[PDB]
Short mmCIF file of C-alpha atoms and ligand atoms in Angstrom, two decimals:
data_model
loop_
_atom_site.label_atom_id
_atom_site.label_comp_id
_atom_site.label_asym_id
_atom_site.label_seq_id
_atom_site.Cartn_x
_atom_site.Cartn_y
_atom_site.Cartn_z
CA UNK A 1 0.00 0.00 0.00
CA UNK A 2 0.99 3.67 -0.18
CA UNK A 3 1.49 3.62 3.57
CA UNK A 4 1.06 6.83 5.51
CA UNK A 5 4.43 7.97 6.80
CA UNK A 6 5.66 9.37 10.11
CA UNK A 7 8.09 12.30 10.26
CA UNK A 8 10.10 13.25 13.35
CA UNK A 9 11.44 16.71 14.16
CA UNK A 10 15.21 16.38 14.58
CA UNK A 11 15.21 19.20 17.16
CA UNK A 12 12.45 18.32 19.65
CA UNK A 13 11.11 14.87 18.70
CA UNK A 14 7.59 15.91 17.67
CA UNK A 15 6.13 13.44 15.17
CA UNK A 16 3.80 14.30 12.30
CA UNK A 17 1.73 11.38 11.02
CA UNK A 18 0.40 11.68 7.46
CA UNK A 19 -2.56 9.53 8.54
CA UNK A 20 -3.59 12.13 11.14
CA UNK A 21 -2.57 15.45 9.62
CA UNK A 22 -2.58 18.51 11.85
CA UNK A 23 -6.18 19.77 11.92
CA UNK A 24 -5.44 22.76 14.15
CA UNK A 25 -3.44 24.31 11.27
CA UNK A 26 -5.83 23.26 8.50
CA UNK A 27 -3.79 20.19 7.54
CA UNK A 28 -6.31 17.44 6.89
CA UNK A 29 -5.71 13.84 7.86
CA UNK A 30 -4.06 12.13 4.91
CA UNK A 31 -1.99 15.15 3.88
CA UNK A 32 1.26 13.83 2.46
CA UNK A 33 4.49 15.48 3.57
CA UNK A 34 5.21 17.06 0.18
CA UNK A 35 1.72 18.60 0.13
CA UNK A 36 2.08 20.44 3.44
CA UNK A 37 2.65 24.16 2.72
CA UNK A 38 6.09 25.46 3.58
CA UNK A 39 4.59 28.04 5.98
CA UNK A 40 4.04 25.17 8.42
CA UNK A 41 6.55 24.48 11.18
CA UNK A 42 6.99 21.98 13.97
CA UNK A 43 4.27 23.00 16.47
CA UNK A 44 6.49 22.28 19.46
CA UNK A 45 9.75 24.04 18.53
CA UNK A 46 9.20 25.98 15.28
CA UNK A 47 11.64 24.01 13.13
CA UNK A 48 11.00 23.98 9.39
CA UNK A 49 9.89 20.93 7.42
CA UNK A 50 13.46 20.51 6.21
CA UNK A 51 14.36 19.72 9.85
CA UNK A 52 12.31 16.50 9.94
CA UNK A 53 13.39 12.91 9.29
CA UNK A 54 11.12 10.18 7.99
CA UNK A 55 10.57 7.37 10.51
CA UNK A 56 10.59 3.71 9.51
CA UNK A 57 7.54 1.91 10.90
CA UNK A 58 6.73 -1.79 11.16
CA UNK A 59 4.07 -3.64 9.18
CA UNK A 60 0.55 -3.58 10.58
FE1 FE B 101 10.35 20.38 16.80
ZN1 ZN B 102 2.93 -0.76 0.37
ZN1 ZN B 103 2.26 15.80 -3.66
ZN1 ZN B 104 -0.92 28.49 5.86
ZN1 ZN B 105 16.02 24.60 10.50
#
């Protein structure tokens, strides 16, 4: 499947999940990383999207 991916802020550890989005900022569940506008930042420390690393997750 086109699995939904997890991305971890390299500065504070916050994790964005494509499956959940970030509704408080208008980012719908299912929003893929490349489709998030660049005005968005880590909600917990302000780091830019470029400061995230994709997380490898196990099969489910
Ligand atoms: Fe952060
Ligand atoms: Zn797959
Ligand atoms: Zn896209
Ligand atoms: Zn915006
Ligand atoms: Zn940065």
